[PDB]
Amino acid sequence: LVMSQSPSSLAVSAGEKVTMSCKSSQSLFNSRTRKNYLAWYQQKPGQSPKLLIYWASTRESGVPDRFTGSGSGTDFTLTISSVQAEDLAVYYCKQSYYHMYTFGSGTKLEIK
């Protein structure tokens, strides 16, 4: 199982929308619970990881609608509506199915 994220680095202006990908070499869809065990985390410098989305598209309580997770099977997407200064961080995807390769390599988000 290979988890791959892209792009590695995103540099945009405030207010812009961005999308990032997380691919898996194997399907993360479980025919039992019928859900994709893929989550997205926000990692700021030295801070504790922050859960943004789980079950591929379920937004964690406290997270604004600006963060949206989508996709199924092998291709997943994290969308951030209008990037703001507080969004500056590295975003990682984590799969909880086979569990051979847990986290993706991450996408760094910055402004300007």
PDB file of N, CA, C and O in Angstrom, residues 6 10 14-15 21 28-29 31 40 43 48 50 64 73 75 89-90 93 95:
ATOM      1  N   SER A   6      -0.124  15.203  -3.293  1.00  0.00           N
ATOM      2  CA  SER A   6       0.342  16.207  -4.238  1.00  0.00           C
ATOM      3  C   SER A   6      -0.670  17.342  -4.247  1.00  0.00           C
ATOM      4  O   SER A   6      -1.845  17.132  -3.955  1.00  0.00           O
ATOM      5  N   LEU A  10       2.068  24.465  -2.049  1.00  0.00           N
ATOM      6  CA  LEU A  10       1.085  25.361  -2.644  1.00  0.00           C
ATOM      7  C   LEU A  10       1.312  26.765  -2.108  1.00  0.00           C
ATOM      8  O   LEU A  10       1.343  26.973  -0.897  1.00  0.00           O
ATOM      9  N   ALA A  14      -4.200  35.320  -0.429  1.00  0.00           N
ATOM     10  CA  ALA A  14      -5.308  35.244   0.512  1.00  0.00           C
ATOM     11  C   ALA A  14      -6.652  35.266  -0.211  1.00  0.00           C
ATOM     12  O   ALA A  14      -6.822  35.979  -1.200  1.00  0.00           O
ATOM     13  N   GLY A  15      -7.596  34.472   0.285  1.00  0.00           N
ATOM     14  CA  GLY A  15      -8.917  34.420  -0.314  1.00  0.00           C
ATOM     15  C   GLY A  15      -9.081  33.413  -1.439  1.00  0.00           C
ATOM     16  O   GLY A  15     -10.205  33.112  -1.838  1.00  0.00           O
ATOM     17  N   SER A  21      -4.490  16.601  -3.419  1.00  0.00           N
ATOM     18  CA  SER A  21      -4.825  15.194  -3.574  1.00  0.00           C
ATOM     19  C   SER A  21      -4.073  14.221  -2.686  1.00  0.00           C
ATOM     20  O   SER A  21      -2.957  14.484  -2.247  1.00  0.00           O
ATOM     21  N   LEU A  28      -9.556   2.161  -0.343  1.00  0.00           N
ATOM     22  CA  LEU A  28      -9.720   2.349   1.095  1.00  0.00           C
ATOM     23  C   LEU A  28     -11.187   2.227   1.480  1.00  0.00           C
ATOM     24  O   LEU A  28     -11.577   2.531   2.608  1.00  0.00           O
ATOM     25  N   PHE A  29     -11.997   1.777   0.529  1.00  0.00           N
ATOM     26  CA  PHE A  29     -13.428   1.615   0.751  1.00  0.00           C
ATOM     27  C   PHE A  29     -13.750   0.254   1.358  1.00  0.00           C
ATOM     28  O   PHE A  29     -13.388  -0.785   0.805  1.00  0.00           O
ATOM     29  N   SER A  31     -16.438  -2.529   2.279  1.00  0.00           N
ATOM     30  CA  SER A  31     -17.761  -2.996   1.880  1.00  0.00           C
ATOM     31  C   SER A  31     -18.644  -3.341   3.076  1.00  0.00           C
ATOM     32  O   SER A  31     -19.847  -3.558   2.925  1.00  0.00           O
ATOM     33  N   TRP A  40      -7.991  13.647   7.094  1.00  0.00           N
ATOM     34  CA  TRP A  40      -7.115  14.769   6.766  1.00  0.00           C
ATOM     35  C   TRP A  40      -6.756  15.534   8.034  1.00  0.00           C
ATOM     36  O   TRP A  40      -7.625  15.836   8.854  1.00  0.00           O
ATOM     37  N   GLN A  43      -1.338  20.467  10.207  1.00  0.00           N
ATOM     38  CA  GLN A  43      -0.175  20.510  11.077  1.00  0.00           C
ATOM     39  C   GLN A  43       0.557  21.838  11.004  1.00  0.00           C
ATOM     40  O   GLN A  43       1.168  22.167   9.989  1.00  0.00           O
ATOM     41  N   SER A  48       0.233  20.704  17.943  1.00  0.00           N
ATOM     42  CA  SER A  48      -0.306  19.350  17.921  1.00  0.00           C
ATOM     43  C   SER A  48      -1.195  19.212  16.687  1.00  0.00           C
ATOM     44  O   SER A  48      -1.911  20.148  16.323  1.00  0.00           O
ATOM     45  N   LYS A  50      -4.125  18.615  14.080  1.00  0.00           N
ATOM     46  CA  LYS A  50      -5.542  18.929  14.224  1.00  0.00           C
ATOM     47  C   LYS A  50      -6.376  18.152  13.212  1.00  0.00           C
ATOM     48  O   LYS A  50      -6.195  18.297  12.005  1.00  0.00           O
ATOM     49  N   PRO A  64     -14.641  24.833  10.149  1.00  0.00           N
ATOM     50  CA  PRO A  64     -15.502  25.605   9.247  1.00  0.00           C
ATOM     51  C   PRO A  64     -15.753  24.920   7.905  1.00  0.00           C
ATOM     52  O   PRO A  64     -14.964  24.080   7.467  1.00  0.00           O
ATOM     53  N   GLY A  73     -12.578   5.361  -2.900  1.00  0.00           N
ATOM     54  CA  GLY A  73     -11.748   4.345  -3.513  1.00  0.00           C
ATOM     55  C   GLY A  73     -10.268   4.625  -3.361  1.00  0.00           C
ATOM     56  O   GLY A  73      -9.678   4.312  -2.326  1.00  0.00           O
ATOM     57  N   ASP A  75      -8.708   7.808  -5.075  1.00  0.00           N
ATOM     58  CA  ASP A  75      -8.404   9.229  -5.249  1.00  0.00           C
ATOM     59  C   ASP A  75      -9.225  10.119  -4.320  1.00  0.00           C
ATOM     60  O   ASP A  75     -10.446  10.226  -4.466  1.00  0.00           O
ATOM     61  N   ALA A  89      -0.054  25.940   6.974  1.00  0.00           N
ATOM     62  CA  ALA A  89       0.371  24.714   7.638  1.00  0.00           C
ATOM     63  C   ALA A  89       0.634  23.619   6.611  1.00  0.00           C
ATOM     64  O   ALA A  89       0.590  23.861   5.406  1.00  0.00           O
ATOM     65  N   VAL A  90       0.913  22.414   7.097  1.00  0.00           N
ATOM     66  CA  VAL A  90       1.135  21.277   6.218  1.00  0.00           C
ATOM     67  C   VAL A  90      -0.047  20.337   6.444  1.00  0.00           C
ATOM     68  O   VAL A  90      -0.407  20.046   7.585  1.00  0.00           O
ATOM     69  N   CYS A  93      -2.817  13.348   4.853  1.00  0.00           N
ATOM     70  CA  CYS A  93      -3.945  12.440   4.795  1.00  0.00           C
ATOM     71  C   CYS A  93      -3.481  11.164   5.479  1.00  0.00           C
ATOM     72  O   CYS A  93      -2.303  10.796   5.399  1.00  0.00           O
ATOM     73  N   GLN A  95      -4.780   7.044   6.208  1.00  0.00           N
ATOM     74  CA  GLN A  95      -5.704   5.962   5.886  1.00  0.00           C
ATOM     75  C   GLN A  95      -5.743   4.956   7.031  1.00  0.00           C
ATOM     76  O   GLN A  95      -4.708   4.637   7.620  1.00  0.00           O
TER      77      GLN A  95
END
